[PDB]
């Protein structure tokens, strides 16, 4: 197998600290243009940052009582479609769609008109005056806490996870119609993650124990993965669509080759503590795991689409720098869409940029 030296580029150092949050950074997202990092924190704010300088350029306070242990900013993600300025934010039992005033008319109006056009498991509400001042354009109110949100590639649909909400633990929302639907009749376990396939009409649903793949067109289950863990935390799907990685609180990362077998192709043990995030690069043959030990591990993976060879996975680099706070370390991470750059969110109140 090739040495890391033969597998550059990959990140090896922290060049930039995004400093300002006054509480744990639970979630972060990079915008479609690859220039703007958004972060969500227990200090009750969402912030947007100029990625190469670390300069904070925007802040909105979504929770005025940030000391409240009952609800927090849980998950944020920029809409993936270019030039609409939309940021989705799950906080408590609500999803806000926010368009920050940092892009100008052509982009901001595109987002706002998209969200306004659409004008019972979930309710879609016009913002109050207080919410307008926070740059909220619409709010989707669910019955239970929303822990995870993920956009479909085309930027109209998004899926959310409400753990222990039974039949409505997984909801699919459609911005253009202000429509929320529960795709499933049956609740199978506590749901940890839900993600659309990169190009197939499929939804991947991660429970604590399994990953189930549904064909939304055929309306049927097509595969059930058996990772062999009791406490799955997150999944990501390889950009060419035939492989998956899964993190677990029991310190493992599982690679599943979806066509090869339902059990893990490879089990990676590179963390001393619970693994909170796994993330594929969208273009480069890289992925990462991030854990409560405060470390990020970076891997190479070559996938052989056509020929009878299984994936080649090579560890590249251990990234250290985040501080462990109350047994928590790196809470989230996301790759730049094009560069070998990784962004991480820390329990230590920082986000960080890791570069070559």
Residue numbers in the entry: 416 to 534, 571 to 807
Describing publication, verbatim:
Erb1/Bop1 is a eukaryotic protein that was firstly described as an evolutionary conserved factor involved in large ribosomal subunit biogenesis in yeast and mammals respectively. Its function is essential in the processing of rRNA precursors that give rise to the mature 5.8S and 25/28S particles. Erb1 directly interacts with Nop7 and Ytm1 proteins (Pes1 and Wdr12 in mammals, respectively) forming Nop7 sub-complex (called PeBoW in mammals) that co-purifies with pre60S particles but remains stable even after its dissociation from pre-ribosomes. The C-terminal region of Erb1 was predicted to contain seven WD repeats that form a β-propeller domain of unclear function.
Here we present the structure of the β-propeller domain of Erb1 at 1.6Å resolution that was obtained during crystallization trials of Erb1/Nop7 dimer. The solved structure of the C-terminal domain of Erb1 has confirmed that it folds into a seven-bladed β-propeller as previously predicted. Structure analysis led us to slightly extend exact boundaries of the domain (residues 427–807) towards the N-term, when compared to the sequence-based prediction (residues 435–807) because the strand D (outermost) of blade 7 (most C-terminal) is actually formed by residues 427–433 which participate in the “velcro-like” closure of the domain. Electron density map allowed us to trace and build model for residues 515–534 and 571–594, being the rest of the insertion unmodeled. Helix H2 (residues Tyr520-Asp532) appears between strands 2C and 2E and is attached to the base of the propeller. We observe that in this case there is a different interaction network, conserved in Erb1/Bop1 family but not in other WD repeat-containing proteins, that involves strand 2D from blade 1 and a short α-helix, H3, from blade 2 (Gln580-Lys585). The third area corresponds to the long 6C-7D loop which forms an important extension and introduces Asp757, Met758 and Met759 into a cavity formed between Phe635, Tyr665 and Gln670 from blades 3 and 4. Indeed, as seen for the electrostatic surface analysis, the tool found a big region of basic residues on the surface that included five blades and the entrance to the central channel on the top face of the propeller. Taken together, our observations demonstrate that the C-terminal domain of Erb1 is likely to form part of a protein complex and is capable of binding RNA unspecifically through a defined surface.
